[PDB]
Amino acid sequence: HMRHRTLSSSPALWASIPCPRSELRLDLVLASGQSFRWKEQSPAHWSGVLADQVWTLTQTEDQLYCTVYRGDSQVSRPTLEELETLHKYFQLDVSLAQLYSHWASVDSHFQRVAQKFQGVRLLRQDPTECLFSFICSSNNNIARITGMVERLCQAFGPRLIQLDDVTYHGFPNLHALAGPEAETHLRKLGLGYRARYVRASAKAILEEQGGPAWLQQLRVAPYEEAHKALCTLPGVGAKVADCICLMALDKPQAVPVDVHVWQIAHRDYGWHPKTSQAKGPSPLANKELGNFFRNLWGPYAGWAQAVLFSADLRQ
Ligand SMILES: Clc1ccc(Nc2ccncc2)cc1Cl
Ligand code: NI
C-alpha cells in the first residue's frame, strides 16, 4: 500500500528545521543505542515512531528535513507544534559546539576523539519508553534490544500505520505490561529473564508509585532523588537508572557506568579507584568513577560520555 518516503520521492510533504550537521548527526544519534526504534529504511533516511505518530528524517549539511505520517486522513507536512516536538526531542536549544569546545579545553583526549565524531547529542525520550527499553538492555547488544523492543511494541502497543513491510506500533502503556499473562507472553518474545522485570516494574509503577505521572515527577526532581527512586524498581540498577536519568529525565550530569566505561576510563584517562582499594567494578567504585567524570567535564558529563560511546561503536 503506502510506502516509506524519500526526500526525492515526495518533496512536497517534507518540512525542515535549520540545523547544521555539526549540531546533530542522525547517523550517529539514532543508531547510537539511545533509542532502538529508528531504522535506516532507505539510505540516509531514518524512520521511527514518536508518541502515536511515525516520522521519517534526513538531513543535509545545514538542514534537517523531516516528514510525518499521522496514520489514521489527509497526508500533509509537519505542523508547527509537530516540529516543536521534534525540536524538543533533539534538545536543540542546547549548543553542542559550545559543549565540545568546553570539554576539549579540559580534556585533551576528548579533543583528539571528538574531531571525527561531531553532532553527537542526547535525545529527550519518553520516560516509559526509555525505562522498559533499558530494562531489556542488561547483558545485551543494540541489535538484540532493538529486536526485543520492536516485538514488545507489536504485541502490546497500538497499531499506528503500515509502510512497506513494516507495521509501526506505539509504545505500550503501563497497564498493558502489568497484566497477569504479561511475563509469559514476553518470555515467548525472547526477553528471557528481562520479561519478569518488565511486568514487575509496570505493576510497581502503577501500584507503588501511582502511574506514569510518577516518572514526570522524577523529571523535575533532582538527579540524586530520581536515581534512588528508579533503583527501587525490579531490574533497575545504577547503570539503567543513570541511562534513564540522562536520556529521559533531563539530568545531563548522569554518567552510566558499566565495565565498558571502566575500560575507557582506565585505558584513556589512566583512572584507578583511589578512595577504593578493591581493584574491580563495585557499587562504590562505579559511583566514584561517575563523580570523576562529572568533576572533569561538568554538568553535561553524560553528553560528553555519549560522544566517547559513539566513537567506540565505530572501532
Ligand atoms: Cl551514553 C549511552 C548511550 C547509549 C547506550 N546504549 C547501550 C548500548 C548497548 N548496551 C547498553 C546500552 C549506553 C550509553 Cl552508556
Ligand atoms: Ni593501570
XYZ file of C-alpha atoms and ligand atoms in Angstrom:
331
model
C 0.000 0.000 0.000
C 1.648 3.252 1.201
C 5.462 3.346 1.340
C 8.416 4.935 3.148
C 9.108 8.410 1.748
C 12.419 9.693 0.446
C 13.289 13.371 0.061
C 13.215 12.967 -3.731
C 10.048 10.817 -3.815
C 7.639 13.288 -2.225
C 9.411 16.670 -1.728
C 6.057 18.402 -1.107
C 5.379 16.629 2.191
C 8.781 17.319 3.782
C 9.407 20.307 6.061
C 12.723 21.444 7.583
C 14.310 22.791 10.771
C 17.586 24.782 10.341
C 20.213 22.569 11.975
C 23.922 22.194 10.999
C 25.407 18.688 10.703
C 27.861 19.868 13.387
C 24.971 20.162 15.880
C 23.372 16.799 15.037
C 24.381 13.736 13.022
C 21.336 11.470 12.620
C 23.563 8.558 11.586
C 25.448 8.758 14.913
C 22.496 9.512 17.223
C 19.565 7.345 16.082
C 21.593 4.090 15.981
C 23.791 5.089 18.946
C 21.682 2.947 21.293
C 19.740 5.782 22.926
C 16.569 4.869 21.054
C 16.074 1.464 19.430
C 13.034 2.487 17.367
C 14.819 4.174 14.433
C 15.846 2.301 11.275
C 17.528 3.480 8.077
C 14.811 2.179 5.749
C 16.177 3.846 2.620
C 19.812 5.158 2.613
C 20.240 8.247 4.831
C 16.503 8.173 5.653
C 15.638 7.371 9.275
C 12.113 6.225 10.157
C 10.731 5.633 13.653
C 7.788 6.425 15.922
C 7.299 9.377 18.281
C 4.368 9.015 20.682
C 1.446 7.898 18.486
C 2.993 9.110 15.215
C 5.568 7.956 12.672
C 8.319 10.137 11.206
C 10.971 9.839 8.539
C 14.063 12.033 8.946
C 17.053 13.005 6.798
C 19.477 15.939 6.723
C 21.854 17.993 4.578
C 24.926 19.956 5.716
C 22.717 22.776 7.034
C 19.128 21.424 7.143
C 17.169 18.702 8.960
C 14.464 17.518 6.544
C 11.551 15.682 8.166
C 8.017 14.436 7.413
C 5.145 12.883 9.401
C 2.616 10.086 8.860
C -0.392 10.572 11.171
C -1.636 7.041 10.464
C -5.429 7.352 10.733
C -6.608 11.314 6.785
C -5.005 13.911 4.505
C -1.243 13.326 4.304
C 0.320 16.772 4.808
C 3.574 18.347 6.009
C 4.624 18.623 9.700
C 2.665 21.289 11.595
C 4.376 23.876 13.826
C 3.627 22.067 17.107
C 4.727 18.803 15.480
C 8.070 20.499 14.714
C 8.302 21.941 18.247
C 8.015 18.318 19.399
C 10.905 17.319 17.125
C 12.987 20.322 18.221
C 12.491 19.315 21.868
C 13.240 15.629 21.172
C 16.690 16.689 19.927
C 17.141 19.317 22.682
C 18.276 21.776 20.006
C 18.164 24.751 22.384
C 21.472 23.408 23.712
C 24.584 24.413 21.741
C 26.732 21.348 21.052
C 29.565 23.412 19.536
C 29.904 25.176 22.895
C 29.889 21.897 24.843
C 32.507 20.283 22.575
C 34.695 23.385 22.965
C 34.265 23.383 26.755
C 35.093 19.673 27.098
C 38.040 19.820 24.678
C 39.518 22.639 26.790
C 39.676 20.478 29.942
C 40.275 17.091 28.291
C 42.983 16.571 25.656
C 41.802 13.001 24.996
C 38.323 14.318 24.184
C 39.911 16.849 21.812
C 41.525 14.068 19.749
C 38.430 11.836 19.657
C 35.601 14.367 19.209
C 37.104 15.735 15.964
C 35.952 12.732 13.906
C 32.568 12.447 15.680
C 30.662 15.741 15.701
C 26.913 16.172 16.213
C 26.520 13.579 18.983
C 23.752 14.866 21.265
C 21.225 13.293 23.638
C 17.600 12.665 22.711
C 14.853 13.634 25.157
C 12.929 10.357 25.312
C 9.565 9.459 26.839
C 10.348 8.072 30.354
C 8.175 4.973 29.879
C 9.669 4.014 26.509
C 13.147 4.664 27.906
C 12.644 2.726 31.151
C 11.430 -0.507 29.557
C 13.872 -0.206 26.651
C 16.780 -0.084 29.115
C 15.417 -2.933 31.248
C 15.821 -5.024 28.080
C 19.438 -3.831 27.793
C 21.183 -5.760 30.575
C 23.705 -8.255 29.168
C 22.639 -7.475 25.601
C 23.650 -5.693 22.377
C 21.939 -2.942 20.360
C 20.807 -5.430 17.690
C 19.047 -7.738 20.157
C 17.483 -4.896 22.191
C 16.150 -3.270 19.006
C 14.524 -6.625 18.232
C 13.006 -7.167 21.685
C 11.571 -3.636 21.791
C 10.003 -3.968 18.331
C 8.340 -7.296 19.164
C 7.221 -5.857 22.519
C 5.549 -2.854 20.864
C 3.937 -5.030 18.178
C 2.420 -7.419 20.732
C 1.337 -4.906 23.408
C 1.213 -1.463 21.748
C -1.459 0.137 19.469
C -1.008 -0.302 15.712
C -0.462 3.071 14.008
C 0.257 2.577 10.283
C 1.868 0.179 7.797
C 4.597 1.342 5.412
C 6.136 -1.216 3.043
C 6.596 -4.431 5.064
C 6.886 -2.632 8.415
C 3.949 -2.164 10.801
C 4.602 0.638 13.292
C 3.150 0.396 16.806
C 3.140 2.926 19.634
C 4.904 2.113 22.897
C 2.615 0.240 25.366
C 1.124 1.890 28.437
C 1.942 0.550 31.897
C -1.428 -1.194 32.331
C -0.755 -3.219 29.172
C 2.564 -4.517 30.566
C 1.236 -5.031 34.115
C -1.295 -7.766 33.292
C -1.151 -11.419 34.540
C -0.193 -13.074 31.231
C 2.356 -10.315 30.542
C 5.555 -12.131 31.572
C 4.508 -15.375 29.866
C 3.810 -13.577 26.572
C 7.020 -11.520 26.866
C 9.041 -14.687 27.564
C 7.636 -16.028 24.282
C 9.187 -12.979 22.573
C 12.687 -13.919 23.759
C 13.351 -11.352 26.514
C 14.241 -14.214 28.881
C 14.813 -13.080 32.484
C 14.036 -9.495 31.431
C 10.341 -10.399 31.000
C 9.913 -10.675 34.779
C 11.436 -7.226 35.322
C 9.236 -5.590 32.657
C 5.963 -6.851 34.148
C 7.147 -6.334 37.725
C 8.275 -2.754 37.020
C 4.998 -1.912 35.261
C 2.971 -3.392 38.134
C 5.243 -1.492 40.552
C 4.970 1.924 38.874
C 1.148 1.683 38.929
C 0.608 0.361 42.447
C 3.703 1.635 44.286
C 4.029 4.995 42.515
C 0.597 5.881 41.085
C 1.114 5.607 37.325
C 3.084 7.472 34.600
C 2.764 10.814 36.420
C 5.405 9.433 38.793
C 8.009 9.482 36.015
C 7.186 13.122 35.206
C 7.795 13.945 38.886
C 11.286 12.450 38.568
C 11.933 14.684 35.540
C 11.519 17.773 37.758
C 13.038 16.031 40.800
C 16.822 16.467 41.355
C 19.147 13.877 39.796
C 20.029 12.120 43.056
C 16.378 11.682 44.093
C 15.353 10.401 40.653
C 18.207 7.870 40.618
C 17.369 6.491 44.077
C 13.697 6.395 43.046
C 14.423 4.444 39.845
C 16.723 1.985 41.664
C 13.765 0.701 43.723
C 12.273 -0.893 40.584
C 12.749 -4.590 39.613
C 15.547 -4.944 37.042
C 16.762 -1.349 37.506
C 20.233 -0.806 38.965
C 22.594 2.178 38.988
C 23.540 1.744 35.313
C 19.994 1.550 33.930
C 18.822 4.277 36.326
C 21.584 6.579 35.044
C 20.666 5.819 31.423
C 17.053 6.842 32.093
C 18.017 9.899 34.155
C 20.277 11.040 31.313
C 18.092 10.187 28.331
C 14.548 10.880 29.563
C 14.632 12.813 32.874
C 16.769 15.816 31.867
C 19.760 15.021 34.094
C 22.733 15.863 31.784
C 25.172 15.126 34.631
C 24.161 11.452 34.915
C 27.003 9.174 33.783
C 26.019 5.471 33.317
C 28.925 3.280 34.453
C 29.464 -0.323 33.330
C 32.580 -2.406 32.566
C 32.910 -0.761 29.138
C 33.337 2.748 30.592
C 35.741 1.289 33.176
C 37.856 0.132 30.239
C 37.844 3.557 28.561
C 38.452 5.328 31.888
C 41.464 3.152 32.706
C 42.912 2.972 29.183
C 42.264 6.529 28.009
C 42.264 8.501 31.299
C 44.578 6.303 33.398
C 41.889 6.150 36.089
C 42.058 3.738 39.012
C 39.736 3.712 42.082
C 41.572 5.959 44.524
C 39.277 6.170 47.553
C 38.688 2.450 46.961
C 41.286 -0.327 47.129
C 39.226 -3.200 45.663
C 40.620 -3.244 42.147
C 37.492 -4.205 40.149
C 33.983 -2.780 39.412
C 31.855 -2.290 42.532
C 28.800 -0.202 43.611
C 31.113 2.365 45.225
C 33.883 2.297 42.593
C 31.340 2.849 39.810
C 29.885 5.859 41.643
C 33.422 7.135 42.286
C 34.041 6.918 38.530
C 30.765 8.720 37.809
C 31.850 11.574 40.091
C 35.273 11.574 38.405
C 33.757 12.385 35.004
C 31.337 14.992 36.400
C 34.294 16.787 38.001
C 36.278 16.726 34.741
C 33.530 17.549 32.236
C 30.958 19.419 34.350
C 27.116 19.197 34.457
C 26.741 17.794 30.913
C 29.071 14.866 31.662
C 26.582 12.289 30.350
C 26.508 14.100 26.991
C 30.311 14.092 26.839
C 30.233 10.357 27.570
C 27.775 9.903 24.686
C 30.456 11.295 22.357
C 33.038 8.750 23.565
C 30.457 5.939 23.401
C 29.574 6.829 19.793
C 33.305 6.921 18.952
C 33.772 3.392 20.367
C 30.975 1.677 18.390
C 32.967 2.785 15.328
C 36.058 0.712 16.194
Cl 25.693 7.198 26.761
C 24.971 5.712 26.242
C 24.237 5.711 25.070
C 23.644 4.545 24.635
C 23.771 3.364 25.360
N 23.167 2.181 24.884
C 23.537 0.858 25.171
C 24.090 0.054 24.172
C 24.465 -1.225 24.475
N 24.332 -1.777 25.688
C 23.804 -0.998 26.640
C 23.404 0.294 26.439
C 24.520 3.363 26.539
C 25.109 4.538 26.972
Cl 26.026 4.485 28.438
Ni 46.527 0.819 35.267
